[PDB]
Design a protein around this ligand. Structure first.
Ligand SMILES: [Mn+2]
Length: 278
C-alpha cells in the first residue's frame, strides 16, 4: 500500500547531500570538495535505503553547491555526468524514487523578472540533475509562492513563466502550502500546466479550504501518470504553525492511511529524518 522516504540527509549515517559554502568562497576547488562529499553521501543513502525498506529520497538543493549561480566557476554537467549516471543506475537498481524541493526564494511568479530568471535557472538545474540521474519517475516539487499584492496575477505569471520549460515540466509537481494556496487552488494551477499535484497533509490541515483530506487526495491522485506522491509531517507542539515535529505522530499516520484512495509514495518530513516515524 505504501512506499516510504525521507529528505536530504540521514541521521544514523551522518550523511548529507546538502553541504554548501558561503558565496565568498565559491571557487572551483572549494565547490568540488563539497560536491564530492555530497555525491559520496548520496550513494551511502541509496545503499542504506535498499537495506532498510525505504524507496524514496529527496536530494538536497545543495548537492552541487551554487550550480545555478551566474558565477558558478566550471561546467558541472561535464564534471559530474558520468558519476551521476552511475548514481542513478544504482538508484534504479535499488527501486529508489528521487525528488527535489527548491528553496523559499524560487518563485517564477515574482513581479521581478530577475527573480523569475534566477528561479527558473534553479528549476532547470534541478530538472537537469534528475535527467543526468535518469530518474524517470522523478519529482520536482514546487510551492506556488508569494502573492505580491494579487494572487490572481501572481498565478498567471507563474503559469506563463513555466509553460515553455519542457524539461522542468517533465518532473514538476505542484504543492499546497500553509498560508496562500490550498489544494483546490493548486489543482487549478497544475491543470493549466499539465502537471501532478503533491498534497502536503500538514499544510492541508493548516489551510484545508473546503476539502477534507480524503477528498483532497481523491482529486490529487488522478493527476499522476504513475504513483502519486504525498508529503506527511506533524505540527511541532512547541513551535509556530508549519514547523515540522521531530517525529510524525501515530495519529497523523492513521489519518493519512485512512484517507488514501489508493497506493501512494509517502515522503516523511520530520526533523528525525529516517527516524521520523519513517
Ligand atoms: Mn510543511
Amino acid at each position: 500500500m505504501i512506499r516510504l522516504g525521507y529528505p536530504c540527509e540521514n541521521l544514523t549515517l551522518g550523511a548529507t547531500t546538502n553541504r554548501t559554502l558561503r558565496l565568498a568562497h565559491l571557487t572551483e576547488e572549494r565547490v568540488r570538495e563539497k560536491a564530492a562529499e555530497n555525491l559520496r553521501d548520496l550513494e551511502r543513502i541509496l545503499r542504506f535505503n535498499a537495506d532498510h525498506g525505504f524507496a524514496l529520497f529527496r536530494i538536497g538543493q545543495h548537492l552541487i553547491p551554487f550550480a545555478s549561480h551566474p558565477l558558478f566557476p566550471y561546467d558541472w554537467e561535464g564534471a559530474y555526468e558520468e558519476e551521476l549516471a552511475r548514481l542513478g543506475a544504482l538508484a534504479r537498481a535499488f527501486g529508489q524514487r528521487l525528488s527535489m524541493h527548491p528553496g523559499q526564494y524560487v518563485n517564477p511568479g515574482s513581479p521581478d523578472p530577475e527573480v523569475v530568471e534566477r528561479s527558473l535557472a534553479e528549476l532547470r538545474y534541478s530538472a537537469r540533475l534528475l535527467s543526468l540521474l535518469g530518474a524517470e519517475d522523478g519529482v520536482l516539487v514546487l510551492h506556488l509562492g508569494g502573492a505580491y499584492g494579487e494572487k490572481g496575477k501572481a498565478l498567471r505569471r507563474f503559469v506563463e513563466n513555466l509553460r515553455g520549460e519542457e524539461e522542468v515540466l517533465r518532473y514538476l509537481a505542484l504543492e499546497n502550502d500553509e498560508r496562500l494556496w490550498n489544494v483546490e487552488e493548486v489543482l487549478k494551477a497544475a491543470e493549466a500546466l499539465g502537471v501532478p499535484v503533491v498534497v502536503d497533509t500538514l499544510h492541508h490541515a493548516l489551510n484545508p479550504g473546503r476539502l477534507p483530506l480524503e477528498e483532497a487526495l481523491r482529486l490529487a491522485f488522478p493527476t499522476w501518470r504513475g504513483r502519486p506522491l504525498v508529503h506527511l509531517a506533524s505540527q511541532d507542539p512547541k513551535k509556530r504553525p508549519g514547523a515540522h515535529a521531530f517525529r510524525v505522530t501515530r495519529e497523523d499516520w492513521e489519518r493519512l492511511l485512512s484517507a488514501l484512495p489508493g497506493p501512494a509514495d509517502v515522503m516523511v518530513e520530520a526533523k528525525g529524518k529516517e527516524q521520523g516515524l519513517a
